[PDB]
């Protein structure tokens, strides 16, 4: 209903929905995200402003914005693959070779964002959309924010994202660096793909399962399901002191990351 028709509901979140929109002339498809500024106008001015900076093969394409009353419409690549969340078999995961591919692509996407000084802040499988040839695209810049401007980094102080994905320091410190938290959530997504389960509800000393990982009890799952090469990488990503935690340029030199698996 706006030059294009709204065919089916797609991602009914809080604040609005995402629809599938076909143009009836050209037959082309898009995702219309629909935010009713009555049911924030501030976090939404940022989303689109961030979205206009973005252009990469692993980040959902931004086509434009119209205001139509209270109603903001963001015109967004439609990913006919859907969510990576759905290619994770509960308790089992997915073939190592697909995980490694999705991880290569997620890395590419994140390097990109980080190189333009943007942290996504909410990387989880629900936010990783797949296109028609199963290429992974980083989605939903609703919580994204700028952490380098004019070549100066600034620490974040707002807590956000999704607890099982979040990095311990975001719980513990008043200010933290933006990049390592994005790395940590990327690691949790790896664990998710390779084991089909989340290792803990939040990285708290108060959280049993989290305490067992710091004690290297990798004899429990989801670790036992994982396999020594990728698990060695997870050991370098899910490090607690954000400063000792591996960085992306170094993930790119890790053995499992550079292992041939897939045709
Ligand atoms: O193939 C299917 O079964 C459905 O395909 C989908 C399913 C969910 C979503 C899409 C495509 C999207 N394409 O862009 C999409 C975008 C979304 O954006 C959310 C945001 O920007 O917050 C959310 C859900 C979906």
From Swiss-Prot:
Expressed ubiquitously with the most abundant expression in thymus, testis, small intestine and colon. GO terms for molecular function: ATP binding; histone H3T11 kinase activity; protein domain specific binding; protein kinase activity; protein serine kinase activity; protein serine/threonine kinase activity. Phosphorylated by ATR in a RAD17-dependent manner in response to ultraviolet irradiation and inhibition of DNA replication. Phosphorylated by ATM in response to ionizing irradiation. Ubiquitinated. Mono or diubiquitination promotes nuclear exclusion. Ubiquitination and degradation are required to terminate the checkpoint and ensure that activated CHEK1 does not accumulate as cells progress through S phase, when replication forks encounter transient impediments during normal DNA replication. 'Lys-63'-mediated ubiquitination by TRAF4 at Lys-124 activates cell cycle arrest and activation of DNA repair. Its main location: nucleus. ATP binds at residues 10-18, 33. It comes from the Eukaryota. Interacts (phosphorylated by ATR) with RAD51. Interacts with and phosphorylates CLSPN, an adapter protein that regulates the ATR-dependent phosphorylation of CHEK1. Interacts with BRCA1. Interacts with and phosphorylates CDC25A, CDC25B and CDC25C. Interacts with FBXO6, which regulates CHEK1. Interacts with PPM1D, which regulates CHEK1 through dephosphorylation. Interacts with TIMELESS; DNA damage-dependent. Interacts with FEM1B; activates CHEK1 in response to stress. Interacts with TLK1. Interacts with XPO1 and YWHAZ. Interacts with CDK5RAP3; antagonizes CHEK1. It is linked to Oocyte/zygote/embryo maturation arrest 21: An autosomal dominant, female infertility disorder characterized by zygote development arrest due to failure of pronuclei fusion. This is Serine/threonine-protein kinase Chk1. The gene is CHEK1. The chain holds residues 6 to 271 of 476 of the full protein.
